[PDB]
Design a protein around this ligand. Structure first.
Ligand code: DGT
Ligand code: CA
Ligand code: K
Length: 425
DNA sequence: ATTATGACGCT
């Protein structure tokens, strides 16, 4: 009882820009706004691969990783924006810069962990504490939560349902207790309304957010009510929420580990995990995964929000699928040079912006017919931001993969250069 | 012939 720590010490938020690349194109081109539209890469093969879909378009069944010519079968009025092409490859600079706009606004409110180009985690514990002192016992009005849902409420139309649930939550709230986790979450949610308002004011971008006591719950909460809405998942809401939550829906259980949890334990939903002892879970899935699962199925997770706003690596990738696979030496060299030239641009810009240099170059390749997604991964020293030297070094490091007797065999289906191991500058 | 990334764990 009094000694089971309940994982209620922190207020963590997960903010996620709704269909981010689509929003970036729709800010730049108003004719796309409030319309079924998607963002594609390339156009020749089946109209290009779709990588982002507005919610209007999603209502027609358009999804990511779907050819544009097929999405047009589901949605004949679909509008398409194309990713920039530079040096023969997709170039995602417009979106990295829009992402930095968003991240810099979020960093004004709290410390953020950049989880990907369009989502960040937020540690709000200090901010909530400050705000609770600033209220001086004043009760939190529903007007401060115009877009917040309270998961599991109401108990016992859609905006109506939302406001009913918020009303029940706020009526139950104990505002004189500056240490009640639920109050803390509620103030976190007010601050997240403010963050999202500032993001939309200052960028035009809308997002969704989850507010809970840890990153996994925040992330799960954020997906509950999209787009342009935020969701508070309280500790108390976890048993019901998890009682029908497929295991695959939890961050990091969507793959082979989730599938083996399901198969080995003979369960479907996250809450069923609570019936196993910690030792049992460790015995099946290893000591780290076991401990993490034992706590996570109880709503408890300790992974900190890392203070890291900038990416840890800067990478350049291109697949060469099917017949476009590279089969000559000139081909591999020219594409390694294209890759190294984009990477050098991004790296010099990073050095000027963020006062740091990369020190290690990683070269990954895939060879045709190889089952694995990386056929080889070798690193070398990165000592100057020079595209020609970088491409020469990558070739030097992969050349003993050619089995020909000017040809390249097996032909290459992927090149990949990554600058890593940053040091202050 | 979803592709372009990017974080992190394991050994
Ligand atoms: N090139 C490329 N970009 C991707 C891929 N997957 C996602 N992206 C880009 C486009 C998305 O807008 C953005 C963020 O990914 P998300 O999972 O958050 O989806 P998105 O923001 O589009 O939609 P959402 O509103 O969050 O459901 O990253 C991919 O496989 N390849
Ligand atoms: Ca998103
Ligand atoms: K994301």
């Amino acid at each position: 009882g009094p000694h089971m720590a309940t994982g209620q010490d922190r207020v963590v938020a997960l903010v996620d820009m709704d269909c981010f690349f689509v929003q970036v194109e729709q800010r730049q081109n108003p004719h796309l706004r409030n319309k079924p539209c998607a963002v594609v890469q390339y156009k020749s093969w089946k109209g290009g691969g779709i990588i982002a879909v507005s919610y209007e378009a999603r209502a027609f069944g358009v999804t990511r990783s779907m050819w544009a010519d097929d999405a047009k079968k589901l949605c004949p009025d679909l509008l398409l924006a194309q990713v920039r092409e530079s040096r023969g490859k997709a170039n995602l600079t417009k979106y990295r810069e829009a992402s930095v706009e968003v991240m810099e606004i979020m960093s004004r409110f709290a410390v953020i962990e950049r989880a990907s180009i369009d989502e960040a985690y937020v540690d709000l514990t200090s901010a909530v504490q400050e705000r609770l002192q600033k209220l001086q016992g004043q009760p939190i009005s529903a007007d401060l939560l115009p877009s917040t849902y309270i998961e599991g409420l109401p108990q016992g139309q859609k905006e109506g349902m939302r406001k009913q649930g918020l009303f029940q939550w706020l009526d139950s709230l104990q505002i004189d207790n500056l240490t009640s986790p639920d109050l803390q979450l509620t103030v976190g949610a007010v601050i997240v309304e403010e963050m999202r308002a500032a993001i939309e004011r200052e960028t035009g971008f809308q997002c969704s957010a989850g507010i809970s006591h840890n990153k996994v719950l925040a992330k799960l909460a954020c997906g509950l009510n999209k787009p342009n809405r935020q969701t508070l998942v309280s500790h108390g809401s976890v048993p019901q929420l998890f009682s029908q939550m497929p295991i695959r829906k939890i961050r990091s259980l969507g793959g082979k580990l989730g599938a083996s949890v399901i198969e080995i334990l003979g369960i479907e939903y996250m809450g069923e995990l609570t019936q196993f002892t910690e030792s049992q879970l460790q015995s099946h899935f290893g000591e780290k995964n076991g401990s993490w699962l034992y706590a996570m199925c109880r709503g408890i997770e300790h992974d900190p929000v890392k203070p890291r706003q900038l990416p840890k690596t800067i990478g350049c990738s291109k697949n060469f699928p099917g017949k476009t696979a590279l089969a000559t030496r000139e081909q591999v060299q020219w594409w390694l040079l294209q890759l190294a030239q984009e990477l050098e641009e991004r790296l010099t810009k990073d050095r000027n912006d963020n006062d740091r240099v990369a020190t290690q170059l990683v070269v990954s390749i895939r060879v045709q017919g190889d089952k694995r997604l990386s056929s080889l991964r070798r690193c070398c020293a990165l000592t100057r931001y020079d595209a020609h030297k970088m491409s020469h070094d990558a070739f030097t490091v992969i050349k003993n993969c050619n089995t020909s007797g000017t040809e390249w065999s097996p032909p290459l289906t992927m090149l990949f250069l990554c600058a890593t191991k940053f040091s202050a500058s």
